[PDB]
Amino acid sequence: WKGLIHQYKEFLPVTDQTPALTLHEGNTPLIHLPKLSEQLGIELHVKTEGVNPTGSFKDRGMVMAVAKAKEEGNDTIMCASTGNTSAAAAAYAARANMKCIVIIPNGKIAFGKLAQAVMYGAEIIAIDGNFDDALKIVRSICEKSPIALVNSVNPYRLEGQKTAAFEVCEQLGEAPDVLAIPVGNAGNISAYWKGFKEYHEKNGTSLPKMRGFEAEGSAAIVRNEVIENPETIATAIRIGNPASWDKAVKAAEESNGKIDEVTDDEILHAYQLIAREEGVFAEPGSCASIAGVLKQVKSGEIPKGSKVVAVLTGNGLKDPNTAVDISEIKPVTLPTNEDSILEYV
Amino acid sequence: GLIHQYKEFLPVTDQTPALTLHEGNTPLIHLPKLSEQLGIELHVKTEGVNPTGSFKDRGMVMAVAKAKEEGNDTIMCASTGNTSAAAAAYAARANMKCIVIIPNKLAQAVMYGAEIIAIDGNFDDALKIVRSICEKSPIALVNSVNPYRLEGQKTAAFEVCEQLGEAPDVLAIPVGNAGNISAYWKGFKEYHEKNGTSLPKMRGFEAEGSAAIVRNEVIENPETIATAIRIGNPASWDKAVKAAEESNGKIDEVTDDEILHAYQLIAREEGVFAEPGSCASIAGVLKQVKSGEIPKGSKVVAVLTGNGLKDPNTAVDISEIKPVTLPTNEDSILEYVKG
Ligand SMILES: Cc1ncc(COP(=O)(O)O)c(/C=N/[C@@H](C)C(=O)O)c1O
Numbered sequence: 288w289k290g291l292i293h294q295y296k297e298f299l300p301v302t303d304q305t306p307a308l309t310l311h312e313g314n315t316p317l318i319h320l321p322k323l324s325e326q327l328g329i330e331l332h333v334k335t336e337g338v339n340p341t342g343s344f345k346d347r348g349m350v351m352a353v354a355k356a357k358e359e360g361n362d363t364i365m366c367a368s369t370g371n372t373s374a375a376a377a378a379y380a381a382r383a384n385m386k387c388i389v390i391i392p393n394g395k396i397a398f399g400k401l402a403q404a405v406m407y408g409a410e411i412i413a414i415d416g417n418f419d420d421a422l423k424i425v426r427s428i429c430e431k432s433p434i435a436l437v438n439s440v441n442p443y444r445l446e447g448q449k450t451a452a453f454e455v456c457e458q459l460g461e462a463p464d465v466l467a468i469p470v471g472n473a474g475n476i477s478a479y480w481k482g483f484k485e486y487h488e489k490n491g492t493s494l495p496k497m498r499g500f501e502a503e504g505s506a507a508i509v510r511n512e513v514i515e516n517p518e519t520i521a522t523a524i525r526i527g528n529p530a531s532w533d534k535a536v537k538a539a540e541e542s543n544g545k546i547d548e549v550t551d552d553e554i555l556h557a558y559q560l561i562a563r564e565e566g567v568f569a570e571p572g573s574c575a576s577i578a579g580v581l582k583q584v585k586s587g588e589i590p591k592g593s594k595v596v597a598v599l600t601g602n603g604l605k606d607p608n609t610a611v612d613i614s615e616i617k618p619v620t621l622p623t624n625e626d627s628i629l630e631y632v
Numbered sequence: 633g634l635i636h637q638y639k640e641f642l643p644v645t646d647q648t649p650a651l652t653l654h655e656g657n658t659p660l661i662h663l664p665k666l667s668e669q670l671g672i673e674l675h676v677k678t679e680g681v682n683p684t685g686s687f688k689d690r691g692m693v694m695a696v697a698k699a700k701e702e703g704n705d706t707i708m709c710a711s712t713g714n715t716s717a718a719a720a721a722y723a724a725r726a727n728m729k730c731i732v733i734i735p736n737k738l739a740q741a742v743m744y745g746a747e748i749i750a751i752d753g754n755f756d757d758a759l760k761i762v763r764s765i766c767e768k769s770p771i772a773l774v775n776s777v778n779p780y781r782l783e784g785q786k787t788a789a790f791e792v793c794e795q796l797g798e799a800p801d802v803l804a805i806p807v808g809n810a811g812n813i814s815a816y817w818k819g820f821k822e823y824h825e826k827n828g829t830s831l832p833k834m835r836g837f838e839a840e841g842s843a844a845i846v847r848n849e850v851i852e853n854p855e856t857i858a859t860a861i862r863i864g865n866p867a868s869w870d871k872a873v874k875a876a877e878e879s880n881g882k883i884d885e886v887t888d889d890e891i892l893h894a895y896q897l898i899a900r901e902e903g904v905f906a907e908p909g910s911c912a913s914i915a916g917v918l919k920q921v922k923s924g925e926i927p928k929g930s931k932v933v934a935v936l937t938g939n940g941l942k943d944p945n946t947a948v949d950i951s952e953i954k955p956v957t958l959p960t961n962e963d964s965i966l967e968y969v970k971g
């Protein structure tokens with residue numbers, strides 16, 4: 288396995304002049320969750336994108352966007368980020384010998400992502416505004432500067448991210464009934480749908496129902512209005528004006544899917560559920576896909592017996608502070624005695 | 633699944649459950665820029681992509697699968713580090729309880745469902761009581777003395793051979809308790825005798841403040857920023873020594889400054905982020921290339937044992953890249969961007 292550009296070049300806008308950039312991204316596990324599957328009465332798998340080199344699915348788009356930006360002659364890339372896009376941008380820039388400038392919302396990106404941006408060598412600019420404010424600035428600057436924009440409005444980002452749908456079909460042996468996915472800036476749900484349509488066209492696989500889930504306090508698509516003050520403890524998807532809004536809606540309509548919302552309480556519960564029941568640790572915003580499966584299994588929007596693939600978009604180590612916060616452990620102190628300890632259990 | 637992939641090398645029976653979190657098969661990444669600068673062909677085995685973020689997962693999936701096979705219903709260890717996280721995730725995946733005993737970060741382990749119990753002793757007291765409990769109950773001990781952890785961990789050497797297409801000249805690897813260097817060596821020997829691959833020189837690296845094997849003396853209070861390898865009395869000490877001996881290798885030491893320098897270097901130059909303890913393998917490669925013990929033109933695999941996200945505090949603390957705080961205003965941001 289030598290990275291996405293090599294593996295899927297047949298589906299990518301790459302030429303012999305594209306730099307052979309890779310951090311061995313892609314090819315992530317599709318993990319069957321038999322306990323949750325039996326509890327829910329469905330066949331549930333998780334695409335664990337936390338295994339990608341910078342710990343999220345953003346690596347898929349970033350390797351494409353950075354390579355094309357280099358192929359186009361740039362020495363500098365820029366993005367706004369809730370943390371995972373900036374971490375991917377900074378790593379691939381470092382790998383590609385390019386400068387990386389990132390604009391992040393002060394106090395609103397997970398601590399692991401800040402460590403990454405710092406430990407990849409990005410020029411980090413923190414603003415008092417939110418992600419939506421940062422993206423507006425970054426797009427404005429890149430219109431007027433010799434700096435390549437690598438946010439998801441760069442179409443090369445979606446070309447890389449659609450490979451995830453290719454893998455899901457290859458790993459499941461068929462397309463799933465449901466692709467459940469978190470929605471922040473909405474590029475990823477759009478990319479998966481493009482991937483499923485291209486695979487349907489080339490290989491005959493069926494078309495999943497695209498089921499996206501915003502966080503309630505940032506569910507701009509669900510509310511059908513721009514959210515000027517989005518909030519959620521799942522700061523990855525704390526995004527109130529998704530730049531791929533229309534593409535996401537088109538993906539739900541064309542796939543007979545839906546973009547739904549889940550509450551923060553529901554997110555945190557799914558967050559603990561997969562770690563406790565299956566040994567799978569994903570960051571809170573990723574667990575919106577699992578909260579969404581729980582919500583729609585109950586309502587019947589996901590019927591029993593469905594083959595469901597939920598995307599866990601980011602590693603749980605991205606956000607140590609949420610895990611520390613909700614896992615209040617005040618361990619009992621016991622005498623050093625076999626009977627004391629065994630009896631307490 | 634690692635157990636499935638390598639069952640011919642593993643104590644797998646028809647009764648072994650198919651336990652997996654899809655650990656293993658981790659990337660082996662060529663570092664072309666560092667390679668050019670050093671005059672070697674340098675690859676890194678990036679074990680931080682394992683499920684809990686450490687190579688430990690290799691050994692824990694094997695130990696827990698065997699524990700479940702025997703009919704235990706609980707896993708127990710005394711630890712606070714990556715061991716506790718790995719044991720707890722595989723316990724949860726195996727549908728088993730997990731108990732961690734600590735002397736008076738654990739959040740990941742607790743997320744996986746580990747029950748934390750503190751005792752009024754030191755870590756030695758904790759390991760002693762864990763062993764006594766496990767000897768008398770259906771609670772399996774998964775501290776480092778559990779042999780199945782070495783068996784699991786040896787698969788990393790099989791992967792390196794299959795990923796390179798040959799054994800490397802040099803396997804550079806951190807040494808904490810020294811389980812890992814012995815697992816890799818055992819794996820190379822088995823792969824050599826079965827498939828004809830060559831035998832690498834095993835090059836282990838301790839942090840100088842915790843370098844018990846290098847100093848040939850138990851270090852009572854070991855020190856280093858690299859918490860993963862702050863082990864003052866390596867449990868697999870002699871096994872590691874014989875591994876370096878059988879393989880014409882060496883166990884060496886690196887300073888914290890060297891570790892931190894490698895830490896920052898692989899991240900800035902190659903986009904590869906590993907936890908500080910892991911970067912001892914890179915610091916040692918730098919040190920032994922400069923000393924000629926790694927000759928120019930060697931094919932070298934350095935093992936990056938853990939995810940850099942394991943330790944965000946060191947990353948921020950030691951870096952001089954500090955985020956600059958700017959008004960939400962394009963003009964002031966453009967002017968800084970040229971500034
Ligand atoms: C972990 C995680 N999950 C889901 C999403 C949302 O995916 P989307 O709908 O935007 O394609 C993000 C987005 N992170 C971006 C916005 C960032 O890091 O800047 C994310 O980091």
Ligand SMILES: *Cc1c(COP(=O)(O)O)cnc(C)c1O
Nearest residue numbers: 714808809810811812860937938
């Ligand atoms: C456990 C660990 C080590 C030490 O490996 P040993 O087998 O004890 O020599 C090094 N780095 C990380 C990240 C670890 O988890």
